Amino acid sequence: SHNAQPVINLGYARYQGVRLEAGVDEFLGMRYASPPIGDLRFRAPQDPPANQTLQSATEYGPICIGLDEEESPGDISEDCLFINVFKPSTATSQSKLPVWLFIQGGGYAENSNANYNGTQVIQASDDVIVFVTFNYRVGALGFLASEKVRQNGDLNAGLLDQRKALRWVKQYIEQFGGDPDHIVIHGVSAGAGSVAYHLSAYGGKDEGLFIGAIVESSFWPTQRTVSEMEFQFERFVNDTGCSSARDSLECLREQDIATIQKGNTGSPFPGGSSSPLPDWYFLPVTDGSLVPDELYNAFDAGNFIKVPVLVGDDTDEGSNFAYNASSSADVSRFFKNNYPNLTSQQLNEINQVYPRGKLLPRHAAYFGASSAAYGDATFTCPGNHVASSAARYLPNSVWNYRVNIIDESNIAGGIGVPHTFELPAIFGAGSTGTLSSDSSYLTYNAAIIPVTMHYFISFVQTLNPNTYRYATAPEWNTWGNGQRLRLQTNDTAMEAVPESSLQDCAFWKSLTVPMEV
Numbered sequence: 256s257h258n259a260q261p262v263i264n265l266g267y268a269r270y271q272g273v274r275l276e277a278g279v280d281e282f283l284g285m286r287y288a289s290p291p292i293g294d295l296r297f298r299a300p301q302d303p304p305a306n307q308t309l310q311s312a313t314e315y316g317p318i319c320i321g322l323d324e325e326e327s328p329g330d331i332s333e334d335c336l337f338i339n340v341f342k343p344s345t346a347t348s349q350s351k352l353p354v355w356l357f358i359q360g361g362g363y364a365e366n367s368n369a370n371y372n373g374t375q376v377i378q379a380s381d382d383v384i385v386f387v388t389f390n391y392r393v394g395a396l397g398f399l400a401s402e403k404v405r406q407n408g409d410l411n412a413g414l415l416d417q418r419k420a421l422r423w424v425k426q427y428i429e430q431f432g433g434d435p436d437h438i439v440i441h442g443v444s445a446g447a448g449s450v451a452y453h454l455s456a457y458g459g460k461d462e463g464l465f466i467g468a469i470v471e472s473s474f475w476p477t478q479r480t481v482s483e484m485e486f487q488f489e490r491f492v493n494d495t496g497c498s499s500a501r502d503s504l505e506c507l508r509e510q511d512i513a514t515i516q517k518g519n520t521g522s523p524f525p526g527g528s529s530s531p532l533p534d535w536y537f538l539p540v541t542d543g544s545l546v547p548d549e550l551y552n553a554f555d556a557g558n559f560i561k562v563p564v565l566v567g568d569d570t571d572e573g574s575n576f577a578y579n580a581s582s583s584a585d586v587s588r589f590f591k592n593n594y595p596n597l598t599s600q601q602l603n604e605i606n607q608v609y610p611r612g613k614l615l616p617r618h619a620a621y622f623g624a625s626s627a628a629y630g631d632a633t634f635t636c637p638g639n640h641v642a643s644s645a646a647r648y649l650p651n652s653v654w655n656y657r658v659n660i661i662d663e664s665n666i667a668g669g670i671g672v673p674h675t676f677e678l679p680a681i682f683g684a685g686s687t688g689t690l691s692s693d694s695s696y697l698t699y700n701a702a703i704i705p706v707t708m709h710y711f712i713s714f715v716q717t718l719n720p721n722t723y724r725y726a727t728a729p730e731w732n733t734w735g736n737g738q739r740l741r742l743q744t745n746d747t748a749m750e751a752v753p754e755s756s757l758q759d760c761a762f763w764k765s766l767t768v769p770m771e772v
C-alpha cells in the first residue's frame with residue numbers, strides 16, 4: 256500500500272505516514288534522537304535506536320516538558336525528541352526540493368510553536384518544497400548549567416538537540432524528496448536566537464547544514480557564564496530534594512519528572528530583587544564550544560556563516576513580556592532583575608532613552624517605556640545587528656522587515672503589534688493552531704497572508720524573497736544603509752530605519768557587557 260499510505264525507509268527505521276487529499280504526505284512523530292531519560296537526562300542527544308518493526312508516523316509525539324509544566328500522556332513529556340516532515344505526495348528521493356527547516360520558540364523555557372502545519376505553504380509553492388518541524392529540550396531539562404553538568408553531561412543540551420535535528424535533516428531529508436544541499440533554517444523567537452547560535456556555532460565554520468536563514472523576531476536574553484549559573488544549579492538540586500547526595504547529578508537523574516518539576520521554576524538571579532521574577536531563568540550559556548562568545552561579539556567579529564538572511568521584527572516586540580510598570584523605579588527593577596549586572600547609572604540612562612510615554616490601554620503609566628525598552632534590548636536591536644553584520648559580507652542577500660499588522664483586539668489590549676503576530680501570515684490561517692472566530696486574519700487582515708507567505712516561500716526556494724513574490728507585492732530591497740519592508744495589510748512598502756532607532760540600538764550596544772548579550 257506504499258502507492259497509497261506512504262512509507263519512508265531511513266535504514267535505521269521505516270515510517271508509515273499519512274496522505275492528504277491536499278496532495279501532501281505527512282510524517283509525524285519520527286525520532287531523531289534517543290529519549291533523553293534516565294542517564295541521558297542533562298546529556299547531549301544520542302542516535303535514535305535502530306528498529307526493524309514498522310514505525311507509525313501518523314501522529315505527533317509529545318512536546319518537551321518545560322518550565323512550570325506538568326506531564327500529560329501523549330501531549331507533554333520528557334520523551335519528546337521528535338521530528339515531523341511534510342512533503343508533496345508526488346515527490347520522490349530524486350525530487351531534490353528546497354527544504355524549510357523550522358525552529359520553534361518558547362523563550363528556551365517551553366516548546367511554544369510546536370506542530371505547525373506545512374500543508375498550505377507546500378500548496379502555495381505549487382508543490383515543490385519540503386517542510387520540517389521538531390521539538391528540543393527546554394527549561395531545566397534543556398538548560399541546566401554547572402561545572403557538574405559539564406563534567407558528566409553537556410551544557411546547552413537544548414541547543415545540542417537542535418544540532419542533532421539539523422544533522423538528521425542533512426542525513427535523511429533526501430528520502431522525503433528534499434535536497435540536503437538546499438536547506439534553509441527558519442527560527443522564530445527563541446528559535447531565531449537559536450538560528451544566531453547556528454550561524455555562529457563554534458565560531459562560524461560552514462558545516463554545510465544550511466544555505467540560508469530566516470530570523471523571525473530575534474530573542475537575545477542574558478547569556479551568562481557557567482559560574483554565573485552555579486547558584487541556579489544549587490537551587491535546583493535543593494528544590495528537587497537532592498542536596499544531601501554526594502553525586503548531585505546522579506541524584507538528579509534518579510528523580511521522577513514530578514520531582515524535577517518542583518525545581519523547574521523561576522526565581523531571582525543574584526543581585527535581583529524578589530519581584531518581578533526574571534522573564535527567563537534557564538537559558539543558553541557561554542559553553543566555550545558551540546557557544547564560544549556573546550552573540551553581539553561574534554557577529555562583530557564576523558565569526559558566523561555567510562549565507563543569505565531574511566530577518567525582522569514586529570513594531571511592539573516587548574509588549575507581551577515587559578513589566579507592567581507604574582513608575583521609573585518599576586522600569587529599573589524590571590531591567591535589573593533580568594540583567595543584574597546593570598548599574599544604577601545604566602538603569603537611569605535606560606529611563607532617559609525610554610521615558611514614560613503615551614498611556615496604553617489596560618496597562619500602568621510606564622508600561623509603554625518598559626515595553627519599548629525591552630522590545631529593543633531583547634529583540635529588535637539584536638535583529639538589526641544580525642542584518643547589518645550579515646550585510647557586511649553579503650549586502651545583496653540580506654533583507655530586513657518590520658511587521659506592522661494592526662489587529663483591533665491587539666490594540667484594545669494595549670499590545671500594539673506584538674511579538675510573532677505574523678505567524679499565521681507566514682504559514683496560513685489554521686496552520687499555527689485554531690484561530691478565534693473573530694480573528695482579523697479571516698477578515699480585514701486576510702490580504703497580508705498571501706503577500707507574507709509568498710516572500711517567505713520565495714526566500715526558501717531561491718534565497719531571495721522577490722523571485723516568486725505574490726503577484727502584486729512590491730520589490731523588497733536589501734538592508735543597504737538601514738532599509739526594510741514594512742509588512743502591513745494594504746500598506747506594504749520599503750521604509751528607512753529612523754536615525755532615532757539606530758541611535759537607540761547604539762545605546763543598547765554600549766551595554767552588551769553588563770547585560771551579557
Ligand SMILES: *[C@@H]1O[C@H](CO)[C@@H](O[C@@H]2O[C@H](CO)[C@@H](O[C@@H]3O[C@H](CO)[C@@H](O)[C@H](O)[C@@H]3O)[C@H](O)[C@H]2NC(C)=O)[C@H](O)[C@H]1NC(C)=O
Nearest residue numbers: 274275276277278279281283370371372373374375685686
Ligand atoms: C494540516 O492541514 C490540512 C488541511 O490544510 C489537514 O488536512 C485535512 O486532514 C483531515 C484529517 O484531519 C482530512 O479529513 C480525513 O479525510 C480522510 C480521507 O478521506 C477520512 O478518512 C477522514 O474521515 C477525514 O475526513 C482532510 O481531507 C484534509 N484536507 C485536505 C485538503 O487534504 C491536515 O490534517 C493537517 N495536518 C495536521 C498534522 O494537522
Ligand SMILES: *[C@@H]1O[C@H](CO)[C@@H](O)[C@H](O)[C@H]1NC(C)=O
Nearest residue numbers: 304305306307308309310311
Ligand atoms: C520497536 O518499534 C515498535 C513499533 O513502534 C515498538 O512496538 C517497540 O517497542 C520497539 N522496540 C524497541 C525495543 O524499542
Ligand SMILES: *[C@@H]1O[C@H](CO)[C@@H](O)[C@H](O)[C@H]1NC(C)=O
Nearest residue numbers: 579580581617618619620622
Ligand atoms: C496593569 O496595572 C493596572 C493598574 O495597576 C491594572 O489595572 C491592570 O490590570 C494591569 N494590567 C496588566 C496587563 O497586568
Ligand SMILES: *[C@@H]1O[C@H](CO)[C@@H](O)[C@H](O)[C@H]1NC(C)=O
Nearest residue numbers: 661698699700701702744745
Ligand atoms: C484591505 O483592503 C481590502 C479591500 O478593500 C479590505 O477588505 C480590508 O478590510 C482592508 N484591510 C485593512 C486593514 O485596511
Ligand SMILES: [Cl-]
Nearest residue numbers: 256257258259
Ligand atoms: Cl505498497
